[PDB]
Paper text:
Sirtuins are NAD+-dependent protein lysine deacylases implicated in metabolic regulation and aging-related dysfunctions. Sirt1 features the conserved sirtuin catalytic core of ~270 residues, which comprises a Rossman-fold domain and a smaller Zn2+-binding module. A cleft between these subdomains accommodates NAD+ and recognizes the acylated substrate polypeptide with low sequence selectivity, and binding of these substrates is accompanied by Sirt1 closure movements. Tat binds to the sirtuin catalytic core and inhibits Sirt1, Sirt2, and [name] with comparable potencies.
Consistent with the kinetic data, the inhibitory Tat fragment occupies the sirtuin substrate peptide channel but does not overlap with the NAD+ site. The complete basic motif assumes an extended conformation, terminated by Pro58. This conformation resembles the generic sirtuin–substrate interaction, which comprises a four-residue substrate stretch in β-strand conformation inserted between the β8-α9 loop and the β6-α8 loop of the sirtuin. The sirtuin-bound Tat conformation also resembles the conformation of this Tat region in NMR structures of the apo forms of wt-Tat and Tat-Cys−, indicating that the appropriate conformation for sirtuin binding is intrinsically preferred and this Tat region, thus, “primed” for sirtuin binding. The Tat peptide assumes a binding mode deviating from substrates (see below), however, N- and C-terminally from this basic core, supported by charge complementarity. While the N-terminus binds at a positively charged sirtuin surface patch, the C-terminal basic motif with its positive charges occupies a strongly negatively charged sirtuin pocket. Although it is not acetylated, inhibitory Tat Lys50 is positioned in the sirtuin substrate lysine pocket.
Author numbering:
A (entry chain A): 122 to 395
B (entry chain C): 44 to 57
Write the structure that this text describes.
Amino acid sequence: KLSLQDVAELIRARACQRVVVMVGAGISTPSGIPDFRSPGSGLYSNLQQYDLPYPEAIFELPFFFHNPKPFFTLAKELYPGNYKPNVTHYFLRLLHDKGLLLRLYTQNIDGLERVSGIPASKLVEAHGTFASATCTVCQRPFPGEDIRADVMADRVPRCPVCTGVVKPDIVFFGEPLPQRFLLHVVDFPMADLLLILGTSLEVEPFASLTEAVRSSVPRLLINRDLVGPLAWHPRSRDVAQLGDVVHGVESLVELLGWTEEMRDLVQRETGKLD
Amino acid sequence: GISYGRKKRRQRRR
Ligand SMILES: [Zn+2]
């Protein structure tokens, strides 16, 4: 049974230098990104006007073609420029700068991993991105910038060719993940450490990646609960730092001795985004 | 990939 400091010592001695990371929405809540399932935020109020039978309908294709306005309300909120990366993103940024990051697999669509400075080659946006869009009728591709004006003006973007609805390349339920997700067949056999930050692992096939690392590879989970196949199929080197994600990260950063270097990185990265 | 398919919701909780 390993501890949090044991995983930290392995990283300090470069015993684990091919880390794959799996992150979910829990790492972006500190940035102020609201959970549209609970009242309070202006996003929730702007989504109340639409008769959503359940919050997950916003990522379902049948409801999207019934009424795409709820989705583009979320798209307008999550389009780049509204939110900044938080300390958890920059810890992963520092991990890449020190040459320890093999790949970052994210379920999030806020694009904050790219904003933090992690190159696209190191990133697998497994649930899509707002950086590109596709016409639902004629499959014509579009840069995300070409529909930004319509999205910001609360207009459902239409295809200039066939007038079909142009949908951002966000992976809806029932759709296969982007082709870049197939990098897991190469990355996960190669990983020597698996970090799982801020996710409940309720969505497949992303959740089952935790069991794709080899048997001797430790799996560090920083989350408020023990979730997913880490609870029914735990392994001998599984480490679970239960609690607040940010507190778990800044605890690991302190055990690594990166606290001062991390803060200097954040202030220079945050200020440049102004 | 060994039968990796659509984006789908899981179970076994709550
Ligand atoms: Zn079209």
